[PDB]
Amino acid sequence: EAALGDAKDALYAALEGMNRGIFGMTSEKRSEIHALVELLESKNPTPEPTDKLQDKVDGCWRLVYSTISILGKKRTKLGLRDFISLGDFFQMIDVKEEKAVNVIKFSARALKILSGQLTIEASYKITTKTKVDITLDSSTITPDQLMNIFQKNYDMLLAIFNPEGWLEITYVDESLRIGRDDKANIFVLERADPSEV
Amino acid sequence: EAALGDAKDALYAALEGMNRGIFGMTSEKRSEIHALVELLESKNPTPEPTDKLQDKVDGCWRLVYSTISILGKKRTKLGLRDFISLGDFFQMIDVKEEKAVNVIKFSARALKILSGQLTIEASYKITTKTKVDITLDSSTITPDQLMNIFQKNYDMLLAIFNPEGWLEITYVDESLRIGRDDKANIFVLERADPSEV
Amino acid sequence: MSVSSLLEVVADDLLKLNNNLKSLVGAENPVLVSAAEQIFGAGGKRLRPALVFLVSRATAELAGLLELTTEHQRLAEIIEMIHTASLIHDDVIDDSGMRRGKETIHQLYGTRVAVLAGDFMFAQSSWFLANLENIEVIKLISQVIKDFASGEIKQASTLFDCDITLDDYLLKSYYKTASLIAASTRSAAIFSGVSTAICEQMYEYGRNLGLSFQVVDDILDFTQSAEQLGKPAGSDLAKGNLTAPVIFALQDEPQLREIIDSEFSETNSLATAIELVHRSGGIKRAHELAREKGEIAIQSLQCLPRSEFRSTLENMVKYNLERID
Amino acid sequence: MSVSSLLEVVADDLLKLNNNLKSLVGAENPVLVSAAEQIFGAGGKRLRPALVFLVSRATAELAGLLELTTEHQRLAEIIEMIHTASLIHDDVIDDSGMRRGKETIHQLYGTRVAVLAGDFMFAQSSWFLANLENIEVIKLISQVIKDFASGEIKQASTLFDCDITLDDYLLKSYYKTASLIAASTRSAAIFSGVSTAICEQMYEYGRNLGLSFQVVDDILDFTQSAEQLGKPAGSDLAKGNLTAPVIFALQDEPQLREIIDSEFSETNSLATAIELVHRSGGIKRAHELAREKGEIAIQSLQCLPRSEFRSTLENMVKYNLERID
Numbered sequence A, B: 001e002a003a004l005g006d007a008k009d010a011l012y013a014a015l016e017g018m019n020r021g022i023f024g025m026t027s028e029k030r031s032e033i034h035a036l037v038e039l040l041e042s043k044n045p046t047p048e049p050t051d052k053l054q055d056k057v058d059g060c061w062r063l064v065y066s067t068i069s070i071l072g073k074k075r076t077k078l079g080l081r082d083f084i085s086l087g088d089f090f091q092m093i094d095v096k097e098e099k100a101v102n103v104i105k106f107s108a109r110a111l112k113i114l115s116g117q118l119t120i121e122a123s124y125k126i127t128t129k130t131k132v133d134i135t136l137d138s139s140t141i142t143p144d145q146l147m148n149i150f151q152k153n154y155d156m157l158l159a160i161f162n163p164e165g166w167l168e169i170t171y172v173d174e175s176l177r178i179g180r181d182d183k184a185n186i187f188v189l190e191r192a193d194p195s196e197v
Numbered sequence C, D: 001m002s003v004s005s006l007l008e009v010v011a012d013d014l015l016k017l018n019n020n021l022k023s024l025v026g027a028e029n030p031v032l033v034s035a036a037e038q039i040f041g042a043g044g045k046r047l048r049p050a051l052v053f054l055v056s057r058a059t060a061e062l063a064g065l066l067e068l069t070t071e072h073q074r075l076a077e078i079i080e081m082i083h084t085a086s087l088i089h090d091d092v093i094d095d096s097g098m099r100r101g102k103e104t105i106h107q108l109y110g111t112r113v114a115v116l117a118g119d120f121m122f123a124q125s126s127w128f129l130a131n132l133e134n135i136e137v138i139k140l141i142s143q144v145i146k147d148f149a150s151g152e153i154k155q156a157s158t159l160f161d162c163d164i165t166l167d168d169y170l171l172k173s174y175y176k177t178a179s180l181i182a183a184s185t186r187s188a189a190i191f192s193g194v195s196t197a198i199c200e201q202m203y204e205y206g207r208n209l210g211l212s213f214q215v216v217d218d219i220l221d222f223t224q225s226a227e228q229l230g231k232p233a234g235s236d237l238a239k240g241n242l243t244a245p246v247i248f249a250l251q252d253e254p255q256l257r258e259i260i261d262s263e264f265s266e267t268n269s270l271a272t273a274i275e276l277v278h279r280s281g282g283i284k285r286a287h288e289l290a291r292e293k294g295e296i297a298i299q300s301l302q303c304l305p306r307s308e309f310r311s312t313l314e315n316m317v318k319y320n321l322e323r324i325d
């Protein structure tokens, strides 16, 4: 199919330059992007999706759009306007051991020693046949230099990226899924080979 | 004519990148350039040149090669390795009033106010039929900011560029003449419209 | 009311100082000779060394000194080299092409020369100050330098922080501007030999005069048009630096808080924030902020016997306050 | 003989200092926190604060102090922040990507952060020093900073100047290196409370130790191979900076004077100049220059009662001299 296929390409096209929406976005572009993702989640090919977790939701998922924005005072506290480049965001969902990993990678644009990541181990469970109840277990900033940079603001950072709560899985394709957590956030993720992490 | 014509072009070609030889030059290229220059001055089309001053030597002459080099300690005292860009060197020879002007123009990065010049007015005579006798009258650094920069080293600068002495004229063509002053210096000058000064 | 009218009272002091500083900085180094002529725009008629010279002369007359000492003049040069060196370094840090229309040293000569020139002036000031041999003045001025560091830290820390208070802002204004003036005027009083009461009233004269000055420049970065400024109007706001007009506006306007929190994410959002400042009447409360600062300064000077020194000090205050009509 | 073997005697002092300086610089600013961890390579085992600590402890023991005071430790941190801030600023000035293999702050974080970091450390040192409240120590250290400025001026002034003497060169070596060590060791003695004779012998210990160090680094920029150095061998020469091996070579070799006067115009001319240095035996007279410097330093220490402190000070000298065989 190409209807939701070319709509998917359209969403991919509207996202370019917005940096996954993580440092804010003009409101008309946000309305546009939510229009496209609600068009997609209306056209869900995988209904009833929490019993199809392993062949649809299992795998390594790279973030391509989310409503999570880091702006203002916390962008400044984290050093994220001029020093640290918020890199990729992954959400490997492994259904065997019933896990949910959030890997948020970081950089410093010259420092080979700062190129670390924030890891967030979570464990989910299926409450509703379209929802999953996620709970946080472990959290980690590595290496110790990045942890040195973020440690005084560790809880703010984790809380930005904490997958706890629930995740209602609206759209599920083989290379793209769309989620909506309890905080009214949209998470548009795509497939990434687990070597990307 | 093409022998000394394309030899002239060859001299023009061997000079590119040597910055008129004013900040030194590898000895093999200096031997090459003096070879081409003695080839040219052996082919002087204007014998007895001091009686043909108004129609051959008259005009504004831009320096394209000379043995005058500013290297080492003097380059450092004048600020000529990292700050001030020694610009063009002109030698207008106006034969009516028996004048000889040396205009050495100067520059600085982004400093519109430092773009000035050292002016050196001299008066020549005709001692020998191929050889003029030059004597210094006036000297000037303008504007007052460049003079501020050079003033403590004014005599060194003038002495670098002082046309006083005598200038034995060889190979005076219509668009290129070659000089050999009393200090064994070679001066290869070309024609420049007096607005370039 | 004008600048020259104020500074003519110490025009001679100011000229000697400008000459010494041009001679010293730019120490027979070609590039530094040019940069010193560029930095010390001939005449020496700048506010900070002139305040040093006016408090110097007012308090000296009050004290019985017939001339200004060597300490007073080394102090005006310390103050001026510190101020200038800090502005050069601040333009290299946070790359700035212009400073009040004039082009910066960093732009004309490059970062390497600007850093060298600022370092050189800071070194010269360190040494002049050590050789004043007044431990209290050395401490005041070392506090000024340390407060430059504190101010850089706190400025980077409070970018886009809509919960900054007016005491926080006034401390950033102190760190930036008021600290060096307050220090210079208490030190001028100290070297004149007048009492600790007059030296504290001159610290408070310089502190509130420098706070008024900073508040009024904070206002003029809104009012003045984008051509009167080398910058767009409201460039302290675009950049995350919330000054007292914005702080007064965010006390009652919520929409402005949503605008600054997005870091002006919406398009045209800086101009919307500008008009919310002009509508909130935060500019008028900043105008009165500046007037109250200046009036504490004018009341600071009442300790000084009548003269044209302290009349010019009061006109320092008045000129500042009428720079915002 | 080794570096750690020397620095163990005050390893604990050095660790406390490194911790304080990492905490202070990088003052909960993300980029500055990283730059401080980068700058103060964990452990604090660097020569200059260790000299401060060894003269501090030797002279303190001689004086009857049971511990090092707060002044001694603020002084080791002053010395270390000054040295570090000057190296950062020197790498921005005269753009340098590396410093002894390690990469510079200017390269990793950029000029803006390097200038901010160096400025911050200089501000912190200014303030620490003012608050030592010792006018003689404040003067010594202000002279160190002023001599950094003098050294920049004189270094630019003497580029490619084949008529530079060995007293001129040794003054450039002082300005660059020896002044801060001499100041730190006289100040360490001063705060220990020992006599003016022992404080002058510690000024002379520090100035001849720092002169030997500079002479031996001047030699190793010829000796060490182009890869053992982050840069080609003989890079102080290529650049116009004539060190004591070249100055000793130009006393009898004329060809080298024609080579340096052309500013190495001929191709292969730097290598010809290098071999003329290695042939002139200017390296050996520089080697003996360094040994004589170090022996005045070792004779400087004879005022100190026998201890592990002055034995490590004598091994400071010996390690330096055996770094060049």
Ligand SMILES: CC(C)=CCC/C(C)=C\CC/C(C)=C\CC/C(C)=C/CSP(=O)(O)OP(=O)(O)O
Pocket: C086, C087, C089, C090, C091, C093, C094, C096, C122, C145, C148, C149, C150, C151, C152, C155, C176, C177, C241, D118, D119, D120, D122, D123, D126
């Ligand atoms: C090295 C030594 C002894 C002391 C160094 C002093 C030090 C710690 C830092 C240098 C001084 C710096 C960077 C800033 C303070 C000077 C100043 C008035 C800055 C304007 S703040 P903004 O940039 O926001 O405003 P705009 O640019 O518009 O003026």
Ligand SMILES: CC(C)=CCC/C(C)=C\CC/C(C)=C\CC/C(C)=C/CSP(=O)(O)OP(=O)(O)O
Pocket: C118, C119, C120, C122, C123, C126, D086, D087, D089, D090, D091, D093, D094, D096, D122, D145, D148, D149, D150, D151, D152, D155, D176, D177, D241
């Ligand atoms: C701001 C303030 C209070 C003081 C500032 C201090 C000041 C006046 C200047 C900064 C300090 C500078 C630039 C140089 C001195 C430090 C130093 C050891 C330089 C090596 S000289 P070279 O570069 O030739 O050698 P290489 O690079 O190889 O080490």
Ligand SMILES: [Co+2]
Pocket: C090, C093, C094
């Ligand atoms: Co700034």
Ligand SMILES: [Co+2]
Pocket: D090, D093, D094
């Ligand atoms: Co240098």
